[PDB]
Design an enzyme around this catalytic site. Structure first.
Site, PDB file in Angstrom:
ATOM      1  CG  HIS A  62      52.660  17.631  46.253  1.00 21.43           C
ATOM      2  ND1 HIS A  62      52.473  17.249  47.588  1.00 21.43           N
ATOM      3  CD2 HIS A  62      52.530  16.503  45.514  1.00 21.43           C
ATOM      4  CE1 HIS A  62      52.223  15.950  47.625  1.00 21.43           C
ATOM      5  NE2 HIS A  62      52.271  15.474  46.383  1.00 21.43           N
ATOM      6  CG  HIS A  92      50.165  13.441  39.856  1.00 19.83           C
ATOM      7  ND1 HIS A  92      50.360  12.127  40.226  1.00 19.83           N
ATOM      8  CD2 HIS A  92      51.375  13.925  39.481  1.00 19.83           C
ATOM      9  CE1 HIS A  92      51.640  11.807  40.039  1.00 19.83           C
ATOM     10  NE2 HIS A  92      52.280  12.886  39.572  1.00 19.83           N
ATOM     11  CG  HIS A  94      54.574  16.943  37.587  1.00 15.94           C
ATOM     12  ND1 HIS A  94      54.992  17.126  38.891  1.00 15.94           N
ATOM     13  CD2 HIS A  94      54.215  15.641  37.456  1.00 15.94           C
ATOM     14  CE1 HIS A  94      54.992  15.930  39.515  1.00 15.94           C
ATOM     15  NE2 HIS A  94      54.469  15.026  38.685  1.00 15.94           N
ATOM     16  CD  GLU A 104      58.005  15.801  37.587  1.00 17.74           C
ATOM     17  OE1 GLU A 104      57.684  14.636  37.671  1.00 17.74           O
ATOM     18  OE2 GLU A 104      58.310  16.495  38.563  1.00 17.74           O
ATOM     19  CG  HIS A 117      53.630  11.671  36.151  1.00 15.03           C
ATOM     20  ND1 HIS A 117      54.447  12.372  37.021  1.00 15.03           N
ATOM     21  CD2 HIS A 117      54.262  11.680  34.954  1.00 15.03           C
ATOM     22  CE1 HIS A 117      55.536  12.798  36.391  1.00 15.03           C
ATOM     23  NE2 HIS A 117      55.451  12.397  35.122  1.00 15.03           N
ATOM     24  CB  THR A 196      59.282  13.072  39.961  1.00 14.95           C
ATOM     25  OG1 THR A 196      57.878  13.343  39.937  1.00 14.95           O
ATOM     26  CG2 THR A 196      59.643  12.105  38.822  1.00 14.95           C
TER      27      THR A 196
HETATM   28 NA    NA Z   1      50.937  11.777  46.248  1.00 10.95          NA
HETATM   29 ZN   LIG Z   2      54.151  13.061  38.918  1.00  7.35          ZN
END
Ligand code: NA
Ligand SMILES: [Zn+2]
Length: 258
Positions: A62, A92, A94, A104, A117, A196
């Protein structure tokens, strides 16, 4: 995992497996800059990342996480709205399929190209798994990325992405200094929220920096070449791995600045 970001398993479906998705303190949110309350009692943030020990980078299907040794107080966040010492465990991002989406959080409905994040857990709970069960267990520093000039300190991350293209792949990733990802100013907004991604637990103090960092179009392009799928499965590009803004409900966003 079954959940994901597609038409049939994306964020509007998550509440069927994770009913907390419809809770009172979900993230992300839109930060309305004119409704945020300046709070003169908030302290500056204290970011101590000089002794950070990065270990590994992983594609978890993800996002990709850069993971740090969190067995001692080596990279910690203190101050701001926090009580206590929070240890960095992983960061990580997004991102979007296009430069006009991917963050986000949003700021007065403005979306940025990506959001970083940095996840930290409260050392009073002893380990991350215990921390996520507590209302003050995690602090996540959120940093927006806009596309413009390249960020030299990100280049080491983008160069190894080739080696973890598919879900479940990992690579050694030592001696990476996360100080190269911070903007100049540490002014921030803060509110109580949640993870999230599933399990969407409401254990997060969010600290979102006002100043974005810039990254180049070529750097963000390289994030978009990763895959959600495992090796030898049909190719699905890892793009638009962001959850849309959730209702603020009974919460007040505070600002450290005026
Ligand atoms: Na994770
Ligand atoms: Zn995140």
């Amino acid at each position: 995992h079954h959940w994901g970001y597609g038409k049939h398993n994306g964020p509007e479906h998550w509440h069927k497996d994770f009913p907390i998705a419809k809770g009172e303190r979900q993230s992300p949110v839109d930060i309305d800059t004119h409704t945020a309350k300046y709070d003169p009692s908030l302290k500056p943030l204290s970011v101590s990342y000089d002794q950070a020990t990065s270990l590994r980078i992983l594609n978890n299907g993800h996002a990709f996480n850069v993971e740090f040794d969190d067995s001692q107080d080596k990279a910690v966040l203190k101050g701001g709205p926090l009580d206590g010492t929070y240890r960095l465990i992983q960061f990580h991002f997004h991102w979007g399929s296009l430069d006009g989406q991917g963050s986000e959080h949003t700021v007065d409905k403005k979306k940025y190209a990506a959001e970083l994040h940095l996840v930290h857990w409260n050392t009073k709970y002893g380990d991350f798994g215990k921390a996520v069960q507590q209302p003050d267990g995690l602090a996540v520093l959120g940093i927006f990325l806009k596309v413009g000039s390249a960020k030299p300190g990100l280049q080491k991350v983008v160069d190894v992405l080739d080696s973890i293209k598919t879900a479940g792949k990992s690579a050694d990733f030592t001696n990476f200094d996360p100080r190269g990802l911070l903007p100049e100013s540490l002014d921030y907004w803060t509110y109580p929220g949640s993870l999230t991604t599933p399990p969407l637990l409401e254990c997060v103090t969010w600290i979102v920096l006002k100043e974005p960092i810039s990254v180049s179009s070529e750097q963000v392009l390289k994030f978009r070449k990763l895959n959600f799928n495992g090796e030898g499965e049909p190719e699905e590009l890892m793009v638009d791995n962001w959850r849309p803004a959730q209702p603020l409900k009974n919460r007040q966003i505070k600002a450290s600045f005026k």
